[PDB]
Amino acid sequence: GTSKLKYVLQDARFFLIKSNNHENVSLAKAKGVWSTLPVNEKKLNLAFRSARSVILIFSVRESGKFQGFARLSSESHHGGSPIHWVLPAGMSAKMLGGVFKIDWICRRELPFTKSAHLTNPWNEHKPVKIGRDGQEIELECGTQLCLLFPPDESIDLYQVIHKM
Ligand SMILES: CNC(=O)c1cccnc1
């Protein structure tokens, strides 16, 4: 069903998260973590304190798809177990901010062709697939985008709801 999913997304904030490669999304899916540049780290930390759920919607550049979505479970922190991200050419690990813990809500993909009817008011009402890394997606567009993903029957949102 979709009811617990709608409950998790109620009054959420949503952010488009870009990855240069599939490897980093695979790491994020396996380890429940993400790390971004300080400019976006600061925005996500502010958002985490502001809303009952903050949703990251992931897209690998040039893939033509979203690879899933997850909810922040923490503000960023430093000093944890290192993560061997594959970073863009010319980027060292020290250029990243801290590490956010995330709980995956859907690990299934969604092709951009399926979201062509959704526009993001916070990016000039351009199609929601369009945006820089860290672009916020307004509530209604973000909710509808998440509801387009195929249901992920491997995930139980009971555990997510309790963290809220
Ligand atoms: C795992 N994180 C990354 O790959 C990245 C790279 C540049 C900017 N933001 C995030």
Instruction: Please give, one letter per residue, the 3-state secondary structure of the chain.
Output: CCHHHHHHHCCCEEEEEEECCHHHHHHHHHHCEEECCHHHHHHHHHHHHHCCCEEEEEEECCCCEECEEEEECCCCECCCCCCCCCCCCCCCHHHCCCEEEEEEEECCCEEHHHHCCCEEHHHCCEECCCCCCCCEECHHHHHHHHHHCCCCCCCCCHHHHHHC
Place of tokens 């979709």: 2
Ligand 1 pocket mutation, candidates 40, 43, 96, criterion most atoms within 8 A of CB: 96
Query: What domains are there in the chain, each with its CATH number?
Result: 1-164 (3.10.590.10)
The structure was resolved to a resolution in Å of 1.1
Q: Are 78 and 101 in contact (CB under 8 A)?
A: no
Q: Are 54 and 48 in contact (CB under 8 A)?
A: yes
Q: Are 55 and 106 in contact (CB under 8 A)?
A: no
Ligand 1 pocket mutation, candidates 16, 24, 34, 44, criterion most atoms within 8 A of CB: 24
Q: Which atom of ligand 1 is nearest to the CA of 40?
A: 9
Q: What residue type is 56 in one-letter code?
A: L
Q: Which residues pair with 83 in a beta bridge?
A: none
Rounded Cα distance, 117 and 145, in Å? 10
CA of 24 to the centre of ligand 1 (A): 8
Place of tokens 């409950």: 7
- Output the residue whose Cα is nearest ligand 1's atom 10: 36
CA distances from residue 129 to 39, 57, 150 in whole angstroms, order as listed? 21, 10, 17
CA distances from residue 121 to 6, 18, 103, 140 in whole angstroms, order as listed? 21, 19, 26, 9
User: What method was applied to determine this entry?
Assistant: X-ray
Terminal alpha carbon distance of the chain: 20
Q: Are 55 and 9 in contact (CB under 8 A)?
A: yes
Please, how many CA atoms are within 13 Å of residue 78, restricted to the half-sphere of its CB? Answer: 8
Q: Which residues of 76-106 are buried (b: 16+ CB within 10 A; e: fewer)?
A: beeeeeeeebeeeeeeeeeebbbbbbbbbbb
φ/ψ of 128, rounded to 5, equals -60, -25
Q: What are the pocket residues of ligand 1 if the criterion is a CB atom closer than 6 Å to any ligand atom?
A: 19-20, 24, 35-37, 85, 87-88, 133
- Residue 156 labeled ligand binder: no
Q: Are 142 and 150 in contact (CB under 8 A)?
A: no
Q: 110: burial class by Cβ within 10 Å (0-12, 13-18, 19+)?
A: buried
| Contacts of 53 by beta carbon, 8 Å cutoff, 6+ apart | 8, 9, 10, 11, 12, 13, 71, 72, 164
Question: Which of 108, 133, 129, 110 has the alpha carbon at shortest distance from 120?
Answer: 129
- Residue 11 labeled ligand binder: no
Place of tokens 């997606």: 137
Rounded Cα distance, 68 and 89, in Å? 25
CA of 3 to the centre of ligand 1 (A): 32
Rounded Cα distance, 83 and 69, in Å? 20
CA of 53 to the centre of ligand 1 (A): 22
Rounded Cα distance, 66 and 59, in Å? 4
Other Cβ atoms less than 10 A from the Cβ of 26: the count is 14
